[PDB]
Amino acid sequence: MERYENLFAQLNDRREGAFVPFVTLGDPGIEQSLKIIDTLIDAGADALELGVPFSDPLADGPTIQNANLRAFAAGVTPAQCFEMLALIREKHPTIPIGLLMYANLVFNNGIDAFYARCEQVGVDSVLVADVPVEESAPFRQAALRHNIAPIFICPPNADDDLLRQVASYGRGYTYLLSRSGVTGAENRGALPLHHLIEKLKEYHAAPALQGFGISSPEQVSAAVRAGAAGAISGSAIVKIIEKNLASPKQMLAELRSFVSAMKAASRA
Amino acid sequence: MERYENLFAQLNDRREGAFVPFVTLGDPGIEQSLKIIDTLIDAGADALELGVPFSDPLADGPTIQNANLRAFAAGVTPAQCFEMLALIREKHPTIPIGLLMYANLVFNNGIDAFYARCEQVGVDSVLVADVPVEESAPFRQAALRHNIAPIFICPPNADDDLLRQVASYGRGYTYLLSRSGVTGAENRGALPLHHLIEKLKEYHAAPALQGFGISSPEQVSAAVRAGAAGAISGSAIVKIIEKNLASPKQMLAELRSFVSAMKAASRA
Amino acid sequence: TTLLNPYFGEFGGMYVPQILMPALNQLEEAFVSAQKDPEFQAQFADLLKNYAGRPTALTKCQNITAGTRTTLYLKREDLLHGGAHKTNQVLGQALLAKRMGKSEIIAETGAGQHGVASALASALLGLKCRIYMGAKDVERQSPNVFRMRLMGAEVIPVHSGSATLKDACNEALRDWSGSYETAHYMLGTAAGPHPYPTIVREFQRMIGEETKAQILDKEGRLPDAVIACVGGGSNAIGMFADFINDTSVGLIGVEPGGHGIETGEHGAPLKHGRVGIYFGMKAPMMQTADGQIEESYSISAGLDFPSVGPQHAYLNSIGRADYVSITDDEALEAFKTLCRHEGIIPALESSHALAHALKMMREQPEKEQLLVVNLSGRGDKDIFTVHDILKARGE
Amino acid sequence: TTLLNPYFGEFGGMYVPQILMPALNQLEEAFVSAQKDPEFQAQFADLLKNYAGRPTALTKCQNITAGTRTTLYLKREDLLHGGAHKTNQVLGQALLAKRMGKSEIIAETGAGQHGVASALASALLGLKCRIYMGAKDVERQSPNVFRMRLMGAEVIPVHSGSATLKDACNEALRDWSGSYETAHYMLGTAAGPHPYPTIVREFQRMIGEETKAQILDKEGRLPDAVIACVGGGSNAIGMFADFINDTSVGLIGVEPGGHGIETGEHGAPLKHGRVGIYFGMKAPMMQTADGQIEESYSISAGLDFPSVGPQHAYLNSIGRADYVSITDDEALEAFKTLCRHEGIIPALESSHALAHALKMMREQPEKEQLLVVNLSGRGDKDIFTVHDILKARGE
Ligand SMILES: Cc1ncc(COP(=O)(O)O)c(CN[C@H](CNc2ccccc2O)C(=O)O)c1O
Ligand SMILES: Cc1ncc(COP(=O)(O)O)c(CN[C@H](CNc2ccccc2O)C(=O)O)c1O
Ligand SMILES: O=C(NCCOP(=O)(O)O)c1ccc(OC(F)(F)F)cc1
Ligand SMILES: O=C(NCCOP(=O)(O)O)c1ccc(OC(F)(F)F)cc1
Numbered sequence A, B: 001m002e003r004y005e006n007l008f009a010q011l012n013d014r015r016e017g018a019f020v021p022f023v024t025l026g027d028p029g030i031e032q033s034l035k036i037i038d039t040l041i042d043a044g045a046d047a048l049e050l051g052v053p054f055s056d057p058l059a060d061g062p063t064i065q066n067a068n069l070r071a072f073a074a075g076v077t078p079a080q081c082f083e084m085l086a087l088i089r090e091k092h093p094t095i096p097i098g099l100l101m102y103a104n105l106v107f108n109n110g111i112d113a114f115y116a117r118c119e120q121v122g123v124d125s126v127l128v129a130d131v132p133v134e135e136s137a138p139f140r141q142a143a144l145r146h147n148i149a150p151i152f153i154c155p156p157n158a159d160d161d162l163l164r165q166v167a168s169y170g171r172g173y174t175y176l177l178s179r180s181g182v183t184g185a186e187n188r189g190a191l192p193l194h195h196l197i198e199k200l201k202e203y204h205a206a207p208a209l210q211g212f213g214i215s216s217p218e219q220v221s222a223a224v225r226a227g228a229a230g231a232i233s234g235s236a237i238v239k240i241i242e243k244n245l246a247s248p249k250q251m252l253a254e255l256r257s258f259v260s261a262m263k264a265a266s267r268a
Numbered sequence C, D: 001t002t003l004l005n006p007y008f009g010e011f012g013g014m015y016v017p018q019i020l021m022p023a024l025n026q027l028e029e030a031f032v033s034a035q036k037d038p039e040f041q042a043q044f045a046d047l048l049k050n051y052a053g054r055p056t057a058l059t060k061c062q063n064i065t066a067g068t069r070t071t072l073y074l075k076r077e078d079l080l081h082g083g084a085h086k087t088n089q090v091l092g093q094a095l096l097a098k099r100m101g102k103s104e105i106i107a108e109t110g111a112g113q114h115g116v117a118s119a120l121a122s123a124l125l126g127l128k129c130r131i132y133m134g135a136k137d138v139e140r141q142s143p144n145v146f147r148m149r150l151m152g153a154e155v156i157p158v159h160s161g162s163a164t165l166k167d168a169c170n171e172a173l174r175d176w177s178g179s180y181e182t183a184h185y186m187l188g189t190a191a192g193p194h195p196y197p198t199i200v201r202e203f204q205r206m207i208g209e210e211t212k213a214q215i216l217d218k219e220g221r222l223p224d225a226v227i228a229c230v231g232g233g234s235n236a237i238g239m240f241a242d243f244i245n246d247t248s249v250g251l252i253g254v255e256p257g258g259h260g261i262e263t264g265e266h267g268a269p270l271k272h273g274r275v276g277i278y279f280g281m282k283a284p285m286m287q288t289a290d291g292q293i294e295e296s297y298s299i300s301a302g303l304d305f306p307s308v309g310p311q312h313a314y315l316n317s318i319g320r321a322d323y324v325s326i327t328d329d330e331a332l333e334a335f336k337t338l339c340r341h342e343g344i345i346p347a348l349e350s351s352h353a354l355a356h357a358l359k360m361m362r363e364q365p366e367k368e369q370l371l372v373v374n375l376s377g378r379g380d381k382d383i384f385t386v387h388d389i390l391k392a393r394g395e
């Protein structure tokens, strides 16, 4: 499908950026996760980035590590994540859904079989955190064969070779990394580097979404003003889940309020 | 004087061996020590061997180490030991009195001055535990100049050279060491080696007294039958002091009973 | 693009987030430049000789082989400054750090020997050192925590996951992904993303080089086999490297069997795990059926790691090296036997290699064999752990 | 009668009960016979090289002398197997024990390094080892108690007197006077009755011999001075011996100043005691006015001994060697400075020598001086003691 192209076509018509929340699938449990996701969508999420709990998440700070631990405490497995993904797609036919995977979970019992599985459930993209473009060949090839967009990081330390490769290899959107380090809401990412945005556009790369340490509406509007197509927020949202574990009702209301404010900031 | 010669002349006339108790001077205190010594004499002691408390008694097992510790706890010093020696000699003009010294106490402020001090108070002999004949020269020379008998150990591992030197150097009596090790009542010394007794006599050595681990009347009579001129008992006597610390009256009675039985065994 | 091959057959590579690739390429470039730099080689050589005490002795066992046809030598890395082989490559990596203008060092440690080596190197060479150590290991290898802190290193206990080596590894890598501009990651084994497996091998290969020279001098021939323990793979590849082309020499690596392979409480991924992607490399991993990393177990903190360096996975696949496992109890016996009969207190890690050598001898006592065990460390860090165990037994 | 001179000027001799003289004469005779025996020399040399790891490194300090005109080398006896210089002469005495057909070893220990050396030597060479250790030292040097027991040695705590080194000495000598037919007394310093001060010097002199060769190679000249700590005198005489005839080379021995000489809580008999007779020798002793032996004190168990070997007393009297003292606090500073700035954890005993070298440099920082400190041991045994002290301070 072209769920991403259709989304960006529409956002451009409305002259707005995308807002894309991240959550860990199955955090704090399967049923509540499914409700959290519905709430993210109802509140204005343009697309979703969804993490599959992994044992050793090396790109993630404490917030998302603890999300993974909550999901595991609830018995969540990749098999169950694919079960949720089917229910999500069944309710929401148009929203782009991207997975954020660690490499071992993709490689585990066959790279091709993983992407076939994604296509089958109706996922639109996969970003493999620990697969640089240098190692990406069988991943991006399998992705394209199964109509999944492989998504790549354009880091702030990117050179021209990496710009060209990300532009050539990636589909759906380009993940414009706001800063070094691992995920976290309190370590605020810098503004999008203008030179990377321009080069990505010169090389016909997929539209750039800024991610890492994006935690406030001001950062979202600033990313879009800077030329990005939108922004992704993860840890800031997960913190709301963590804060309200004792009250699922208050969890949902706070998620809704935050996503709404974040999405509003993407609007012209 | 010839207190030793006079004693051995007399013992020979009565055809008996000598019994010579050892105690630590000032154990358990000055007054009680003086009484213990009077009791040893009243009970039949032929001569005395008296230890001056030293900090690090390397030739002594636990019994006599603890005697030294009791004397020190009572504040006993070599100066006080010489004060007691004067009172002893004043009461008992004929009994031979030998000191058992560690070398540092003799060397400390002048070897000659130490022996002059012994002569002045009326001591008859000095045995320096950690001065072998090889190191004995200024000790035995000072002793003789002040009419003190230097007493030497004839150990069970003695060769002919050592026999000749002990015979030549020593006066008063020859200390015939019953066994290897350090002092102690439970480690019983062997019988006097016949070959050493005979050689000492061939070389005109001072009469042999057996010492170390002599703790019972049977050992005393056996030493004399073996040809020794007598026996010395130390740890066995000190144990009676240690056992009866709480009862000075019972201490004295037990000392008297033991010395009496020991002395009786020396009789033909 | 790289200057050197990041793979050993199927194994190895550079599976890190894109942010870290320039750091790895920089490090590879500095290593390649340093290797042909006489100044660097002379400085490294001087530190190895005059500071660390190389060459280390090659000791012939006098007693433990009595009545058998085994001749057994111990390569004495326990005599290296710091108390283990880990000191060799730390010195080299520290010089690389300074060459690249880094002022800080991050290191993981488990036995605390790599942490002690990193601390002592950072004290000498003027680097600010922070060490991640699993909280379980902070306790069971406590003497090294004291040593590290005494030398001015920051020791950070890691309570997440199993609170052992892989969790310290995770924290070290997370830290580096944010601090690489000023900090060098002094990885402590021959694993991780390229160029670490290559650099670590090359800065440890003096172990095998000396061993060959020494055994030639004393015996007039090569060993029938060289035997080393394998947690991540550094001491083993350091021993193996110079012998790889001597086909007659057996290369035997020993993974920890823990409570026994059948209990699932072990640290033997090479022979009992399956290939996966984690900690920057494609390598055998202890993993669940659905691809989560399993926690390892070993009595020895230095072997308590659920993966293994890719060159070992490769050497095994082509049959050039053989890998076995040795349990806690077998390691403990070997520890005791060396203490009481050769007067050497070996690391519990090294004891796993010794234990396998003693098996080779005991199983076939009339087989003529000339063996070298890499005695990778001294057991000071282990004496209290071992005492408590032996006492809890009734010995 | 003896084969060799038991005295060094006024000092030395054989002040033991007559029972022990044949043992000493036997030992002297075996030593003299062994010294001219090529077989013995080759066996000793092989153990030193291939088992203990000689020659030890001579390390130039890179940082601690910055901004001064002092060049400072450390003779790395901390790298010897066992962790201190004590291992050298134990190996030699153990071979003597076997030469005289003794099957058992008695040794005193204070730092536990001599005890560890005796244990490891007895494990290798098939001797039954019993060690006397003051109960205070059993606590403050506990890691070595564990090591000794792990190697099969019997460790006997001594609670009498000060419960430190001289009390262990007393017990060792009492034991030997009863067991000399089957046990050799492996005295652990250059003191005691002849022939121990001579044998210990001769089995330690490789320290100075290597040092001279090494400093010649690196600097083209002899040192201005060599500096060693002095508890009983073995590591110092081992360093000094080969330099005694090189009159330009200062020989500087460092006694422990404890809480300060003025407090009377120190271990500096050579410069603050007076000649006396104890522990089989005529030598300077800390003693009361009336001749009782005083108890010493030092933070370091290895220097906590109220006498000193007679050859040092002699060298001092003729002015060939100079002796100074260094306090607990000065030793602690030097300990910390070496850990943090050279990445070496020194024994607290050795730290006293380093401290004096650092004083020589700091007091006169523009004085050109080439110094060697004998780094007699590593500080593993001390890390917990030092931690508790530093913590109790607020550091
Ligand atoms: C004496 C000795 N012998 C052998 C070993 C096994 O390590 P190796 O296989 O590299 O030779 C160690 C490992 N020591 C750990 C683990 N170091 C460590 C282990 C696995 C992954 C990362 C690590 O830093 C450390 O010191 O941090 C050791 O101390
Ligand atoms: C590293 C180090 N450096 C220096 C020293 C000081 O000993 P030294 O002066 O012989 O060179 C020691 C002393 N060590 C004691 C005391 N050994 C000891 C000391 C005095 C009398 C008898 C002893 O066994 C021992 O290991 O038993 C030490 O461990
Ligand atoms: O989107 C991600 N996390 C959620 C957003 O970050 P944050 O808001 O800080 O939680 C996310 C995390 C890791 C990642 O791979 C790599 F590490 F290489 F960048 C890509 C995206
Ligand atoms: O007489 C002594 N002690 C008392 C008697 O011994 P014991 O009955 O076992 O207490 C005695 C103790 C030590 C001594 O010097 C030397 F050690 F060299 F032998 C001589 C005599």
Ligand code: NA
Binding pocket: A104, A107, A108, A109, C275, C276, C277, C287, C291
């Ligand atoms: Na896998």
Ligand code: NA
Binding pocket: B104, B107, B108, B109, D275, D276, D277, D287, D291
């Ligand atoms: Na004196």
Ligand code: NA
Binding pocket: C230, C231, C232, C267, C268, C269, C303, C304, C305, C306, C307, C308
């Ligand atoms: Na492993």
Ligand code: NA
Binding pocket: C228, C229, C230, C231, C232, C233, C234, C235, C236, C237
């Ligand atoms: Na290895």
Ligand code: NA
Binding pocket: D230, D231, D232, D267, D268, D269, D303, D304, D305, D306, D307, D308
């Ligand atoms: Na001393």
Ligand code: NA
Binding pocket: D228, D229, D230, D231, D232, D233, D234, D235, D236, D237
């Ligand atoms: Na010394």
